[PDB]
């Protein structure tokens, strides 16, 4: 049931802007801002070039924290700028592979990852979070085998 959110295409000019009463894309409530950090944490997990780099330890033993740090540095754009575009976030991912991973990502595979972070804001702008919870539930199907095996017993 259901279907993938993307396969290669998404947009080419995606971006977001704050209201005239604000100085950053940050939310008015810290309870609602939580939906946004969760949402980006899910999109960075779907990038292929970063996933291979932590499995091959191209960043050393610290690459396991550099993995979760890549969403943390992109989230900071929304906390300090009143407008952000997919081109801003993409450079924040491309440089995060070259600053210590010694890996270039000229395949543009970071483009569709940047456009997804932009739409997390659009959903959180009207209290929606259905895709942020969906990716969080679909993320667990391999953590029960790529980190700690478990015999399932689900039956609805």
């Amino acid at each position: 049931s259901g279907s993938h959110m993307s396969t290669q295409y998404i947009d080419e000019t995606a971006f977001v802007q704050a209201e005239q009463g604000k100085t950053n894309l940050m939310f008015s409530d810290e309870k609602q801002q939580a939906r946004f950090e969760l949402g980006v944490s899910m999109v960075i997990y779907k990038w292929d070039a970063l996933d291979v780099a932590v499995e091959n330890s191209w960043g050393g033993p610290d690459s396991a924290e550099k993995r979760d740090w890549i969403t943390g540095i992109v989230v900071d754009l929304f906390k300090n700028e009143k407008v952000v575009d997919a081109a801003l976030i993409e450079e924040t991912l491309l440089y995060a592979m070259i600053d210590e991973f010694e890996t270039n990502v000229e395949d543009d595979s970071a483009l569709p990852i940047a456009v997804e972070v932009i739409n997390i804001y659009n959903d959180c702008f009207n209290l929606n979070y259905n895709k942020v919870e969906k990716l969080y539930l679909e993320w667990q199907e391999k953590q029960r085998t790529k980190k700690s095996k478990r015999v399932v017993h689900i039956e609805g």
Binding site: K31, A34, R35, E37, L38, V40, S41, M42, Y45, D62, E65, K66, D68, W69, T71, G72, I73, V75, D76, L77, E91, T92, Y95, A96, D99, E100, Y129, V132, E133, Y136, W139
Partner: peptide
């Protein structure tokens, strides 16, 4: 040539875990 960009290097205080943001968002 061009701007130095906002490109950081490495940190572990701003990082986001798939659960550290879910235990507050869910």
């Amino acid at each position: 040539s061009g701007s130095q960009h906002m490109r950081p290097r490495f940190n572990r205080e701003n990082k986001v875990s798939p659960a550290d943001a879910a235990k507050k968002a869910l």
